[PDB]
Design a protein around this nucleic acid. Structure first.
Ligand SMILES: [Zn+2]
Ligand SMILES: [Zn+2]
Length: 53
DNA sequence: GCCAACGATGGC
DNA sequence: GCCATCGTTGGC
């Protein structure tokens, strides 16, 4: 992907942390789905927008 | 330039 | 049709 190196810790992570702002936004964590980004811990360390990590 | 919010769509 | 999560935008 443009935003995934597929090779760092973040990219290999399969489990949302459930605790960050992005996770708390998610439907599966009871959130309003207004932000719509991946878990902070799954934000590619190389390729993600710097503000997402 | 940032970012909260949202439109878009590939993949299922 | 839905979902995950991307790129875009308007307001600051
Ligand atoms: Zn998280
Ligand atoms: Zn990565």
């Amino acid at each position: 992907s443009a935003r995934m190196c597929g090779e760092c810790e973040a990219c290999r992570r399969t489990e949302d942390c459930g605790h960050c702002d992005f996770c708390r936004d998610m439907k599966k964590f009871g959130g309003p789905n207004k932000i719509r980004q991946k878990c902070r811990l799954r934000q590619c360390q190389l390729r993600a927008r710097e503000s997402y990590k």
